[PDB]
């Protein structure tokens, strides 16, 4: 059964950047998907997306640029102290220059570069580059 809705909604948009498509449908949407998708959009990886409201649980249509190499989820959402963020962004990211780890801190779902400024730990949600 569907354990982890954010897992199936990222491998839906991973498998379509491979196949070269310009739009995905990702049903169902939670609001952790919309926060994660807005972080990818603000760093230019995705572009504009639309939340289709049926009364059940929304679907999202996401317009894709061709800029995303990989989009991933970490399961379980391990807890990440700020003194242990370097090991995580060395195991998961391709270089020191690009790519982001998304973690859910109490100040909001953010990057690892934002979470370093606001001095916050959290739980690792996933990564994109």
């Amino acid at each position: 059964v569907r354990m982890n809705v954010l897992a199936d909604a990222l491998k839906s948009i991973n498998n379509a950047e491979k196949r070269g498509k310009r739009q995905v449908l990702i049903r169902p949407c939670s609001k952790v998907i919309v926060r994660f998708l807005t972080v990818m959009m603000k760093h230019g990886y995705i572009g504009e997306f639309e939340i289709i409201d049926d009364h059940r649980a929304g679907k999202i249509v996401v317009n894709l640029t061709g800029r995303l190499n990989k989009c991933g989820v970490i399961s379980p959402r391990f807890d990440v102290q700020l003194k242990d963020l370097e090991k995580w962004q060395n195991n998961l990211l391709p270089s020191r220059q690009f790519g982001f780890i998304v973690l859910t801190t109490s100040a909001g779902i953010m990057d690892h570069e934002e979470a370093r400024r606001k001095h916050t730990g959290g739980k690792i949600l996933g990564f994109f580059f």
């Binding site: 919309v34 959009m41 504009e48 409201d53």
Partner: protein
């Protein structure tokens, strides 16, 4: 005619109450308007020069305002200049309980008094004679949102001109930006 929760009248809704008062002596709404009363009224601007006044109704009387809505809009927009009127029920927003709170909520808040469930029940009776048939929220590049509300095709020609004032009153009393569509089909 005007029942405020704190008994604070104002010269805006006084004219609205006097306008409603002739409906118990000129029209066929004699038996309806004796039981009904409004609770607030607000005249606002939308569209750069155009004016529109919103009229607030208590909640358990709102369903009785629907059967006489389309007549009262005619009888009220006829009596003064072009000013669109819409009837929005008076729904209390209870705040989202944090980890620190007072000793009032020994019974919990109902989910009808939540900001999401009130910010779209406002939208249902804002646009009243046509009904919402779809909804699509779009998130733009800068992170802002833009709700696209679809409406009924069959009730188009009586509310097709109001759809700039709907956006303005939804911007003022909710904060969110909205656009209205009339789709061709399902």
């Amino acid at each position: 005619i005007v029942k405020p929760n704190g008994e604070k009248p104002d010269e805006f809704e006084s004219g609205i109450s006097q306008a409603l008062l002739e409906l118990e002596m000129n029209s066929d709404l004699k038996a309806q308007l004796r039981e009904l009363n409004i609770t607030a009224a607000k005249e606002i601007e939308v569209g750069g020069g155009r004016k529109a006044i919103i009229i607030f109704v208590p909640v358990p009387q709102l369903k009785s305002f629907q059967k006489i809505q389309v007549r009262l809009v005619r009888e009220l927009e006829k009596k003064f200049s072009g000013k669109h009127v819409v009837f929005i029920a008076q729904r209390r927003i209870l705040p989202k309980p944090t980890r620190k709170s007072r000793t009032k909520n020994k019974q919990k808040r109902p989910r009808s008094r939540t900001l999401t469930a009130v910010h779209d029940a406002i939208l249902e009776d804002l646009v009243f004679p046509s009904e919402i048939v779809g909804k699509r929220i779009r998130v733009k590049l800068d992170g802002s949102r833009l709700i696209k509300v679809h409406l009924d095709k069959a009730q188009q020609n009586n509310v097709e001109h109001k759809v700039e004032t709907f956006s303005g009153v939804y911007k003022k009393l909710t904060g969110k930006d909205v656009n209205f569509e009339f789709p061709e089909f399902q």
